[PDB]
Design an enzyme around this catalytic site. Structure first.
Site, PDB file in Angstrom:
ATOM      1  CG  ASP A 111      -1.937   1.096   1.235  1.00 35.07           C
ATOM      2  OD1 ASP A 111      -2.092   1.738   0.179  1.00 35.07           O
ATOM      3  OD2 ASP A 111      -2.615   1.317   2.262  1.00 35.07           O
ATOM      4  CG  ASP A 150      -3.443   4.442  -2.792  1.00 35.59           C
ATOM      5  OD1 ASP A 150      -2.762   3.494  -2.311  1.00 35.59           O
ATOM      6  OD2 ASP A 150      -4.526   4.823  -2.329  1.00 35.59           O
TER       7      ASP A 150
HETATM    8  C1  7IP Z   1      -5.735  -2.389  -5.031  1.00 37.86           C
HETATM    9  O1  7IP Z   1      -5.631  -2.319  -3.607  1.00 37.86           O
HETATM   10  C2  7IP Z   1      -6.764  -2.565  -2.869  1.00 37.86           C
HETATM   11  C3  7IP Z   1      -7.991  -2.946  -3.396  1.00 37.86           C
HETATM   12  C4  7IP Z   1      -9.074  -3.144  -2.568  1.00 37.86           C
HETATM   13  C5  7IP Z   1      -8.951  -2.963  -1.208  1.00 37.86           C
HETATM   14  C6  7IP Z   1      -7.738  -2.570  -0.650  1.00 37.86           C
HETATM   15  C7  7IP Z   1      -7.621  -2.361   0.822  1.00 37.86           C
HETATM   16  C8  7IP Z   1      -8.542  -2.939   1.691  1.00 37.86           C
HETATM   17  C9  7IP Z   1      -8.447  -2.737   3.054  1.00 37.86           C
HETATM   18  C10 7IP Z   1      -7.435  -1.957   3.568  1.00 37.86           C
HETATM   19  C11 7IP Z   1      -6.511  -1.357   2.726  1.00 37.86           C
HETATM   20  C12 7IP Z   1      -5.399  -0.517   3.299  1.00 37.86           C
HETATM   21  C13 7IP Z   1      -5.887   0.809   3.844  1.00 37.86           C
HETATM   22  C14 7IP Z   1      -6.206   1.776   2.737  1.00 37.86           C
HETATM   23  C15 7IP Z   1      -7.488   2.281   2.550  1.00 37.86           C
HETATM   24  C16 7IP Z   1      -7.736   3.155   1.511  1.00 37.86           C
HETATM   25  C17 7IP Z   1      -6.711   3.516   0.660  1.00 37.86           C
HETATM   26  C18 7IP Z   1      -5.435   2.993   0.848  1.00 37.86           C
HETATM   27  N1  7IP Z   1      -4.430   3.299   0.025  1.00 37.86           N
HETATM   28  N2  7IP Z   1      -5.206   2.141   1.884  1.00 37.86           N
HETATM   29  C19 7IP Z   1      -6.612  -1.560   1.354  1.00 37.86           C
HETATM   30  C20 7IP Z   1      -6.648  -2.377  -1.497  1.00 37.86           C
END
Ligand code: 7IP
EC number: 3.4.23.46
Length: 377
Positions: free
Chosen positions: A34, A220
């Site tokens: 992330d 992101d």
């Molecule tokens: C492509 O990356 C994804 C796709 C779907 C869901 C996630 C996801 C799900 C739960 C937690 C997180 C990490 C926290 C977060 C939330 C919003 C935005 C970002 N960059 N990170 C990611 C990542």
């Protein structure tokens, strides 16, 4: 870096994860990559969706920091207990580091039922770390405690199951074609960049470019969509809808409230235009542009039991918090997070999905004046 090639896995819409080990002896976990957050947070309790979780009681090198963390989202949250421990990346560099780890003890709408990851690796900067910027991100610890160069790069392929590479400490030229073009990191919190112009199909939107970055534009890996501020999304949809008036779809489609389906092998790529984002370059008055396809912003939805077609969700969406260049964009490109020189590099990905018509592109230089006025203060 050949050891690190193909070290990412995923499922569509569900993110890309890397294997990591935490504690001594090593506990293996799959960890979401992330670049849109800054905490290393891992499942530490037996939530029923989890294949695996961090058992601190089994680790001799675990140390409690005696401070909790709480992290809300719109619908959902995670909450945990801070500590440090020794962390490796089996298919990364051959080092071990003492990192902060948030042991997740309670959560809501965080873990995904059916997913194969148990934690998150926030790769962004301390400024957006929680509870505050004194909690050192993993990558800062890594660079500080080892000789790993201060940079990482990501090739997200997608390609059901998805794959990719996270090269830690360098670049691997097998992962891209043509040249890398670099855009400055405007400020080290999110990986914030500046978009200076947007063309749908070659024709540009003619918006105060400032809007393109209201209040942010960020790169992101943890967001699926190309997200756009209300007003730029509004204009953006207007032109794509126009670009594509040949066939018809409801208003809800464009708002991501209903999916669109065509029969197997029957999707009209070409009634959809290419999108080109011009990014601020390294040099005054100099920009470059990255160009993506509808196969990037028209994403399959894996399985809908109420249909048999090739159903896609429109992958552009509006935002209150700015442009977000998510996996839609990144899957087109090899992306270099050159932290040491405060810049992000983009090149055509050796794995992006292409045909014998159109192709993802990174092109430059272009002349663009008043690029500084595109950033919101
Ligand atoms: C492509 O990356 C994804 C796709 C779907 C869901 C996630 C996801 C799900 C739960 C937690 C997180 C990490 C926290 C977060 C939330 C919003 C935005 C970002 N960059 N990170 C990611 C990542």
């Amino acid at each position: 870096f050949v050891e690190m090639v193909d070290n990412l896995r995923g499922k569509s819409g569900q993110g890309y994860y890397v294997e990591m080990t935490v504690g001594s002896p090593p506990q293996t976990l799959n960890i979401l990559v992330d670049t849109g957050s800054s905490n290393f947070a891992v499942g530490a309790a037996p939530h029923p969706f989890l294949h695996r979780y961090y058992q601190r009681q089994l680790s001799s090198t675990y140390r409690d920091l005696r401070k909790g963390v709480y992290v809300p989202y719109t619908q959902g949250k995670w909450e945990g207990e801070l500590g440090t421990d020794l962390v490796s990346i089996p298919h990364g560099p051959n080092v071990t580091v003492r990192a902060n780890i948030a042991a997740i003890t309670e959560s809501d709408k965080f873990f995904i039922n059916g997913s194969n990851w148990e934690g998150i690796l926030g790769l962004a900067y301390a400024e957006i770390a929680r509870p505050d910027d004194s909690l050192e991100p993993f990558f800062d610890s890594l660079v500080k405690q080892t000789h790993v160069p201060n940079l990482f790069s990501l090739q997200l392929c997608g390609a059901a199951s998805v794959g990719g590479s996270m090269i830690i400490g360098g670049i691997d030229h097998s992962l891209y074609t043509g040249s890398l073009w670099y855009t400055p990191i405007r400020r080290e919190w999110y990986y914030e960049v500046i978009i200076v112009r947007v063309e749908i199909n070659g024709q540009d939107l003619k918006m105060d470019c400032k809007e393109y970055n209201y209040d942010k534009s960020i790169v992101d890996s943890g967001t699926t969509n190309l997200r756009l501020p209300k007003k730029v999304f509004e204009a953006a949809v207007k032109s794509i809808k126009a670009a594509s008036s040949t066939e018809k779809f409801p208003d809800g489609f464009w708002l991501g409230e209903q999916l669109v389906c065509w029969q197997a092998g029957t999707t009209p790529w070409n009634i959809f235009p290419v999108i080109s984002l011009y990014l601020m370059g390294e040099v005054t008055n100099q920009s470059f542009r990255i160009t993506i396809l509808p196969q990037q912003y028209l994403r399959p939805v894996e399985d809908v039991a109420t249909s048999q077609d090739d159903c896609y969700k429109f992958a552009i969406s509006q935002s209150s918090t700015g442009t977000v260049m998510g996996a839609v964009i990144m899957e087109g490109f090899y992306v270099v997070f050159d932290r040491a020189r405060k810049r992000i590099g983009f090149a055509v990905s050796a794995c992006h999905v292409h045909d014998e018509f159109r192709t993802a592109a990174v092109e430059g230089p272009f002349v663009t004046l008043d690029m500084e006025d595109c950033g919101y203060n």
